[PDB]
Design an enzyme around this catalytic site. Structure first.
Site, mmCIF file in Angstrom:
data_model
loop_
_atom_site.group_PDB
_atom_site.id
_atom_site.type_symbol
_atom_site.label_atom_id
_atom_site.label_comp_id
_atom_site.label_asym_id
_atom_site.label_seq_id
_atom_site.Cartn_x
_atom_site.Cartn_y
_atom_site.Cartn_z
ATOM 1 C CB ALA A 1 5.480 -15.271 9.702
ATOM 2 C CG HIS B 1 1.503 0.549 -1.573
ATOM 3 N ND1 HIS B 1 0.255 0.690 -0.974
ATOM 4 C CD2 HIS B 1 1.575 -0.727 -2.006
ATOM 5 C CE1 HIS B 1 -0.420 -0.438 -1.128
ATOM 6 N NE2 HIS B 1 0.359 -1.326 -1.729
ATOM 7 C CE1 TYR C 1 17.988 5.380 -13.773
ATOM 8 C CE2 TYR C 1 18.605 6.989 -12.184
ATOM 9 C CZ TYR C 1 17.839 6.633 -13.231
ATOM 10 O OH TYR C 1 16.897 7.572 -13.708
ATOM 11 C CD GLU D 1 18.419 -5.853 7.334
ATOM 12 O OE1 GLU D 1 19.400 -5.669 8.077
ATOM 13 O OE2 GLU D 1 17.297 -6.087 7.769
ATOM 14 C CG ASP E 1 -1.672 -12.011 -15.859
ATOM 15 O OD1 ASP E 1 -0.929 -12.689 -15.152
ATOM 16 O OD2 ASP E 1 -1.433 -11.998 -17.121
ATOM 17 C CB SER F 1 -16.069 16.467 1.042
ATOM 18 O OG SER F 1 -16.854 15.285 0.900
ATOM 19 C CG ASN G 1 13.990 -7.009 7.596
ATOM 20 O OD1 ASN G 1 14.621 -7.692 6.764
ATOM 21 N ND2 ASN G 1 14.144 -7.159 8.925
#
Ligand SMILES: *[C@@H]1O[C@H](CO)[C@@H](O[C@@H]2O[C@H](CO)[C@@H](O[C@@H]3O[C@H](CO)[C@@H](O)[C@H](O[C@H]4O[C@H](CO)[C@@H](O)[C@H](O)[C@@H]4O)[C@@H]3O)[C@H](O)[C@H]2NC(C)=O)[C@H](O)[C@H]1NC(C)=O
Ligand SMILES: *[C@@H]1O[C@H](CO)[C@@H](O[C@@H]2O[C@H](CO)[C@@H](O[C@@H]3O[C@H](CO)[C@@H](O)[C@H](O[C@H]4O[C@H](CO)[C@@H](O)[C@H](O)[C@@H]4O)[C@@H]3O)[C@H](O)[C@H]2NC(C)=O)[C@H](O)[C@H]1NC(C)=O
Ligand SMILES: *[C@@H]1O[C@H](CO)[C@@H](O[C@@H]2O[C@H](CO)[C@@H](O)[C@H](O)[C@H]2NC(C)=O)[C@H](O)[C@H]1NC(C)=O
Ligand SMILES: *[C@@H]1O[C@H](CO)[C@@H](O[C@@H]2O[C@H](CO)[C@@H](O)[C@H](O)[C@H]2NC(C)=O)[C@H](O)[C@H]1NC(C)=O
Ligand SMILES: *[C@@H]1O[C@H](CO)[C@@H](O[C@@H]2O[C@H](CO)[C@@H](O)[C@H](O)[C@H]2NC(C)=O)[C@H](O)[C@H]1NC(C)=O
Ligand SMILES: *[C@@H]1O[C@H](CO)[C@@H](O[C@@H]2O[C@H](CO)[C@@H](O)[C@H](O)[C@H]2NC(C)=O)[C@H](O)[C@H]1NC(C)=O
Ligand SMILES: O=C(O)CC[C@H](CP(=O)(O)Cc1ccc(I)cc1)C(=O)O
Ligand SMILES: O=C(O)CC[C@H](CP(=O)(O)Cc1ccc(I)cc1)C(=O)O
Ligand SMILES: *[C@@H]1O[C@H](CO)[C@@H](O)[C@H](O)[C@H]1NC(C)=O
Ligand SMILES: *[C@@H]1O[C@H](CO)[C@@H](O)[C@H](O)[C@H]1NC(C)=O
Ligand SMILES: *[C@@H]1O[C@H](CO)[C@@H](O)[C@H](O)[C@H]1NC(C)=O
Ligand SMILES: *[C@@H]1O[C@H](CO)[C@@H](O)[C@H](O)[C@H]1NC(C)=O
Ligand SMILES: *[C@@H]1O[C@H](CO)[C@@H](O)[C@H](O)[C@H]1NC(C)=O
Ligand SMILES: *[C@@H]1O[C@H](CO)[C@@H](O)[C@H](O)[C@H]1NC(C)=O
Ligand SMILES: *[C@@H]1O[C@H](CO)[C@@H](O)[C@H](O)[C@H]1NC(C)=O
Ligand SMILES: *[C@@H]1O[C@H](CO)[C@@H](O)[C@H](O)[C@H]1NC(C)=O
Ligand SMILES: [Ca+2]
Ligand SMILES: [Ca+2]
Ligand SMILES: [Cl-]
Ligand SMILES: [Cl-]
Ligand SMILES: [Zn+2]
Ligand SMILES: [Zn+2]
Ligand SMILES: [Zn+2]
Ligand SMILES: [Zn+2]
Lengths: 682, 682
Positions: free
Chosen positions: A475, A621, A216, A364, A598, A562, A459
């Site tokens: 980059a 992810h 939050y 940061e 999309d 497996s 970062n």
């Protein structure tokens, strides 16, 4: 058009912004950084952007006590302080009358005065500790550890020390890692002096952002955790030193000898591991406080003409430990000139097709706080509208070749774009950036193409990529250990102008790469993502994790482990992604165009699991996450990797292998589900 | 057009599908239900849909042991079984040669043979237990509880008993709750006979779906939890009985007298609370097993002409405890005729603008398993493409008036649609459904409009609404206790034809309401959601929860508990939603149209918090969740409600009030963030 954009960018403009951004320190939460934010906001308005706003948050930061300096001591039996470490770094020439250079300190260290015997732990990596405990049978419990900087993020070192029982950590810069052979110390070269120290936070946030408000935004009415429930804070005191101070501490080291040469730096000391010297001890004095402090992001908008509800974001931080000559003002000056150049076309009546957002992030340095809180506030808009995120911290770490880290969805875009740009490299005049980049940094995956690495963290892309699943890239120019003067007072404009990029040509090239990526993303009719590139790396990642498991053939037999479902999913993805690409080359209709775009925008999104990875809810992810042993590095199939890591040491094999198989299922499922997003929609 | 759709629906067709769906039992996981799924799939193909597929999953179900029947006994001191409960329900006339009527049982009861003294706990509601423990000082620990069915979902009763120390639960149907005055028992009326029993699951899943695979579809390679880690399973045995059997158990009850009249049913027993009778005990015998069993959903697709990547879903379950004459075949027969009618226009060359998906879900009766697993498999498609979900379980519970539960986003759509439909009510011939609906069920919120309730759970909309944030709605005919014959063998076609809806006119009206909602959602150019309706209820919900907190004025002072941030957010939402509505009435451009429709589609989505509600990760909507005391009921601002519930009883007030304030922040933030999705996008 693009060429018009690119030709408008000037090396000279970048030079002068850098100069302007580096004459005084811009530490997060200080008035100097607030006034630089106000400057950036007026300039971006003058440069032509439609709106330019400040977004503020009240977050936990950390600062040394001005009246009660932090230091380390060797004490004799009587409790006399017989050697004290330095209280500040000798300022560079011309800067001796600058106020408010924060002294070297480990942000978020708890307060304390531990005394004890030293153990030397090399880089304090996970494997360093394994060697000490397993092979050498040294016990770090109740000991102060001293570890050299390098190889992995400093927060990981502190986490490993804490796990090992240490009661304090001392970090230092070893000349073997921060003193390049044959070059002089600042100010006559670009090496670290014996008096230089690396500042830096030592949190273990795992994507949480502000320690008090995980999930939050830290806005005006936020409910805050108590400090003892704060996320990611270290429980033992920590402080960094230069190598003149370190030699004094190491020179007396006794106990066991270094297990091998990889453990020895370049100081004239035995690099003995300890513990202990013989009646002398080490004593730390840390008095830093944590305080809730307001920070300020600058958010600029250039509205799209055709799809204003589609957002391409270019962002990078503005806060610095001191002057920030490389980190981050070398990136910020490049963003400033990109904004100028876009605003110049705007003023001639041009607009991009999609909306472009430009950000100057705050705090940061203290844990990606500014980017994270803004994304926590705006997560619904980002997740349904976010096309891509291009980061823009330091443009240079070196002057050798280009370095690119990104999602596979952008691999083709970067290949194409760099073939349209000229190299600035000596000996490649009239040749393309792609040509110089691929001679100097060839892929180890195969082909006559350049190396592109995985995104990890450390970062401001982290919230965008690992939490929200927005396609991201970065980059910069790099070297053939980061750069020696990282996070010291010596990292000045002069360092950049004299030794890194006198003609600002490397800066200009990085500005072209970043600016061009943004321009294509924001204006191309069909999104410039190639889903087949994801299919190729998914196969390589599956092979890799398979190989890791096959170190344990007996267990795989016993527990029936497996990988067939993952390989099946990656095959399916490969085939479906091919068909979609065919369809992509075969349609006329804007609803169709918008549907297909999309599908392209949402494909990164599809890899997000809302339950997160085990014990790390903000890393969502499934294909990529920061390594659990080094936040800077990306790891592929992180869930399975971590389930297999050190598995021969767990007490209940069947439970441990059970969890491997569970993560194989989660991965296989998520690859199949992502694939299905690219199927015909009905 | 719509009228063409609506005129094509026939009461006679519905009648004959109902008959066809109710001649044999269709229990989940049985071959009879697989063959009905195959029938539905061929018919929907013949009716004209573009594709029609089966989606299967292997999920945990529960069934009695055929060779080892479940029953309850009164035992004397010597351990003789002096009374045994019935082993099956007397079949209704004409059905005595039907095979495979599952005997009455509580699905997912663990196995066991507990004996002990009885306590009677009324409906076994949270407040029933408070009365027993707090006022009456009766201790249920190590006791078997007997509780009547009614008021709340049976799973909640079992959870409360378990919390109170019980070692068994007996559920029964009291005639006061399931025998309407002046009407006869089946087969001569619609009341429950003394021999009828209510089957039903007793899980506490909190949105998890299949107990073994929370988060992930139970597909062929799924990794499954061990049963002891399964989600939601009860730890004490449970079984239901009719009221002839119950009278025998209650008639001997001693101990304390019922605290008041609300505790007395309509049997000739004292309704004494116990514990105990005097040397006689109760003994249960439960031998049911849990087994992983394949289930089958039927998924039909009618592709949209203009926005095929936008999904309007009409779904309802097919599985039944026995014949399913009302629950669910009365809904399923209505879906079947809606599919026929859409497929008829299709065959004349028509297509809807948006894609329509039609679903016949399996295993709903065992915990909404079929809908949930399918949504877990397809969650990425649903979340980025899902416009709306319209449920279609039983069309009737009664023959009095319309009942509608939905998100506020659909309030206007339903008001408008029901003004276009004719009432089937006696005494309202030539008047509109809206007119009859609003005379008979007036809003208690104000106005000359009809009551519309909140969505809770206990049906297949739950994953769509509470987990994924897809706008959802449902409608059925209801009575002026559910209906008496619920989940008994007596719930037959004959029951419906003779006593509920002889002319199938109520069915036809519900088919018009459901079909019309779907038609408008799928074909209207601008989505038929009104965001201002959400602004109005948010204010009412804020007032409500505010009032609840203001029962504790001293604590609010001491702990500084302000609701100011929530009221501010609701004001902001009200103002932003007004502006968006203005803009909605003022634009021409299909990208603009698509942007505005996306803003409308995503607004339900905006209320989802990916971290979920406390201790309930699969309930993610911040505005609505199933009541923690009754899964069937919706509760508004559930996070704050539960933080305030029974708060005077917690040991650490400051911690308890801390959590109230935390939930106020979460709510206020989420309302503001949802509002901002309707702001201009750049
Ligand atoms: C990659 O895509 C392919 C499709 O191109 C997809 O293939 C599917 O694989 C599953 C197996 O994982 C197939 O499942 C079969 O479906 C039939 C239907 O009756 C069943 O007969 C099979 O079950 C029998 O055998 C089982 C083995 O234990 C028994 O348990 C079961 O009780 C039956 O005896 C099985 O369910 C499925 O049909 C295909 N789909 C196709 C080709 O239509 C594949 O799964 C994708 N990969 C991933 C990871 O998703
Ligand atoms: C509903 O929408 C309104 C906008 O229409 C939005 O109003 C905002 O409210 C916040 C307060 O919550 C305002 O915040 C102020 O911003 C200024 C900028 O300098 C500061 O001066 C204020 O801080 C001072 O006062 C504080 C009080 O303790 C001190 O802590 C602080 O250190 C300063 O002394 C304060 O931050 C904000 O500016 C407006 N936005 C507007 C009008 O632009 C409101 O928050 C929305 N409601 C919700 C729940 O989101
Ligand atoms: C960095 O550049 C800016 C803008 O060119 C300078 O800020 C301006 O300074 C002048 C003179 O003090 C003022 O009249 C303006 O109001 C400032 N403009 C702003 C804030 O946008 C700034 O002084 C430069 N900084 C350094 C160290 O050179
Ligand atoms: C990178 O450039 C290549 C070469 O122009 C692009 O590949 C071609 O794309 C065009 C346009 O659709 C096709 O007609 C060709 O068949 C493609 N050639 C191939 C497949 O090698 C590619 O699309 C570009 N990638 C981007 C823009 O992401
Ligand atoms: C329910 O209706 C269906 C279809 O009208 C009947 O199923 C058909 O039965 C005939 C005769 O047995 C077969 O030739 C067909 O193949 C069936 N069609 C299907 C499965 O689509 C079914 O018998 C009816 N059920 C009852 C109990 O009346
Ligand atoms: C329900 O019907 C009412 C009356 O037709 C609709 O309200 C009108 O909508 C039209 C079309 O945009 C406007 O021109 C009028 O000003 C509206 N009248 C009002 C505000 O009462 C309403 O849009 C319908 N709601 C739906 C379809 O969701
Ligand atoms: O809290 C973090 O995750 C990282 C904070 C900060 C990020 P940085 O801006 O200094 C990373 C970095 C390092 C070298 C270069 I060249 C560019 C960026 C760090 O101490 O590592
Ligand atoms: O597991 C659940 O959440 C509920 C399962 C099942 C749902 P249902 O289909 O029987 C709900 C219901 C009840 C009356 C009517 I009329 C329609 C639907 C129940 O036992 O309550
Ligand atoms: C700095 O140290 C001393 C001793 O506590 C005093 O000046 C003050 O408390 C400190 N400042 C802090 C803790 O912010
Ligand atoms: C180290 O500093 C402490 C505190 O000021 C002091 O007592 C001691 O003498 C110092 N030691 C040296 C060697 O200067
Ligand atoms: C490290 O030493 C501590 C000191 O008490 C001990 O308790 C701990 O178990 C030691 N590590 C080992 C050998 O397990
Ligand atoms: C800049 O380029 C030259 C040429 O190779 C290199 O030797 C020099 O060390 C570079 N500067 C830095 C700081 O790396
Ligand atoms: C039914 O009960 C008996 C005793 O265990 C036996 O027939 C069989 O085990 C049971 N069936 C089950 C447990 O599935
Ligand atoms: C109850 O059933 C058990 C088991 O079959 C039996 O021993 C007992 O006699 C039965 N009691 C009556 C009253 O029929
Ligand atoms: C209920 O009785 C049990 C039996 O041992 C007891 O332990 C429990 O604490 C009792 N409930 C109360 C009064 O707390
Ligand atoms: C059907 O309608 C009549 C008229 O009021 C009502 O009295 C009757 O009880 C209804 N049927 C049922 C089962 O409710
Ligand atoms: Ca936060
Ligand atoms: Ca599941
Ligand atoms: Cl970067
Ligand atoms: Cl329903
Ligand atoms: Zn840095
Ligand atoms: Zn940086
Ligand atoms: Zn039911
Ligand atoms: Zn039902």
């Amino acid at each position: 058009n693009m060429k018009a954009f690119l030709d408008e960018l000037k090396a000279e403009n970048i030079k002068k912004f850098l100069y302007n951004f580096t004459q005084i320190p811009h530490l997060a939460g200080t008035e100097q950084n607030f006034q630089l934010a106000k400057q950036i906001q007026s300039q971006w308005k003058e440069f032509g952007l439609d709106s330019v706003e400040l977004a503020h948050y009240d977050v936990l930061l950390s600062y040394p006590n001005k009246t009660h300096p932090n230091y380390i001591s060797i004490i004799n039996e009587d409790g006399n302080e017989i050697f004290n470490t330095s209280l500040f770094e000798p300022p560079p020439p011309g800067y001796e009358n600058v106020s408010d250079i924060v002294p070297p300190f480990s942000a978020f260290s708890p307060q304390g005065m531990p005394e004890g015997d030293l153990v030397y732990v090399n880089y304090a990596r996970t494997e360093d500790f394994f060697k000490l405990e397993r092979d050498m049978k040294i016990n770090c419990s109740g000991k102060i550890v001293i570890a050299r900087y390098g190889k992995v993020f400093r927060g990981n070192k502190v986490k490993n020390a804490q796990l090992a029982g240490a009661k304090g950590v001392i970090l230092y810069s070893d000349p073997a890692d921060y003193f390049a052979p044959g070059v002089k110390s600042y100010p006559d070269g670009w090496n670290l002096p014996g008096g230089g120290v690396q500042r830096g936070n030592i949190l273990n946030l795992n994507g949480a952002g502000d320690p008090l408000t995980p999930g939050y935004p830290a806005n005006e009415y936020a409910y805050r955790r108590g400090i003892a429930e704060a996320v990611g804070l270290p429980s033992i005191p920590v402080h960094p030193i230069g190598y003149y101070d370190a030699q004094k501490l190491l020179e007396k080291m006794g106990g066991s000898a270094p297990p091998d040469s990889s453990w020895r730096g370049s100081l004239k000391v035995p690099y003995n591991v300890g513990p202990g010297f013989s009646t002398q001890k080490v004593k730390m004095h840390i008095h830093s406080t944590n305080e809730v402090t307001r920070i300020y992001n600058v958010i600029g908008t250039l509205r799209g003409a055709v799809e204003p509800d589609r957002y391409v974001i270019l962002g990078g931080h503005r806060d610095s430990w001191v002057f920030g000559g490389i980190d981050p003002q070398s990136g910020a000056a490049v963003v400033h000139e990109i904004v100028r150049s876009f605003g110049t076309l705007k003023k001639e009546g041009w607009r991009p097709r999609r909306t472009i957002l430009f950000a100057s992030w705050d705090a940061e340095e203290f844990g990606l706080l500014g980017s994270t809180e803004w994304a926590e506030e705006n997560s619904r808009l980002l997740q349904e509208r976010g096309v891509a995120y291009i980061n823009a911290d330091s443009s240079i770490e070196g002057n050798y070749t280009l370095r690119v880290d990104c999602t596979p969805l952008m691999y083709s875009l970067v290949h194409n774009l760099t073939k349209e740009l000229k190299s600035p490299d000596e000996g490649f005049e009239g040749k393309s950036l792609y040509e110089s980049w691929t001679k100097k940094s060839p892929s180890p995956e195969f082909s006559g193409m350049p190396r592109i690495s995985k995104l990890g963290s450390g970062n401001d892309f982290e919230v965008f990529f690992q939490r929200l699943g927005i396609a991201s890239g970065r980059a910069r120019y790099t070297k053939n250990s980061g750069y020696p003067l990282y996070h010291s007072v010596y990292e000045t404009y002069e360092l950049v102008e004299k030794f890194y990029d006198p003609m600002f040509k490397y800066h200009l090239t990085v500005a072209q790469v970043r600016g061009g990526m943004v321009f294509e993303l924001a204006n191309s009719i069909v999104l410039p993502f190639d889903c087949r590139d994801y299919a190729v790396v998914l196969r390589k990642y599956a092979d890799k994790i398979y190989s890791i498991s096959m170190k344990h053939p007996q267990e795989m037999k016993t527990y029936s482990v497996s990988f067939d479902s993952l390989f099946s999913a990656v095959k399916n993805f490969t085939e479906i992604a091919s068909k979609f690409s065919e369809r992509l080359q075969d349609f006329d209709n804007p609803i169709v165009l918008r549907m297909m775009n999309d599908q392209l925008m949402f494909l990164e999104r599809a890899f997000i699991d809302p339950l997160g990875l085990p014990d790390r809810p903000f890393y969502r992810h499934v294909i990529y996450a920061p390594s659990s042993h080094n936040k800077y590095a990306g790891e592929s199939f992180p869930g399975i990797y971590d389930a297999l890591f050190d598995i021969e040491s767990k007490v209940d094999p069947s439970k441990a292998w059970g969890e491997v198989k569970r993560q194989i299922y989660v991965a296989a499922f998520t690859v199949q589900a992502a694939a299905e997003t690219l199927s015909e929609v009905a």
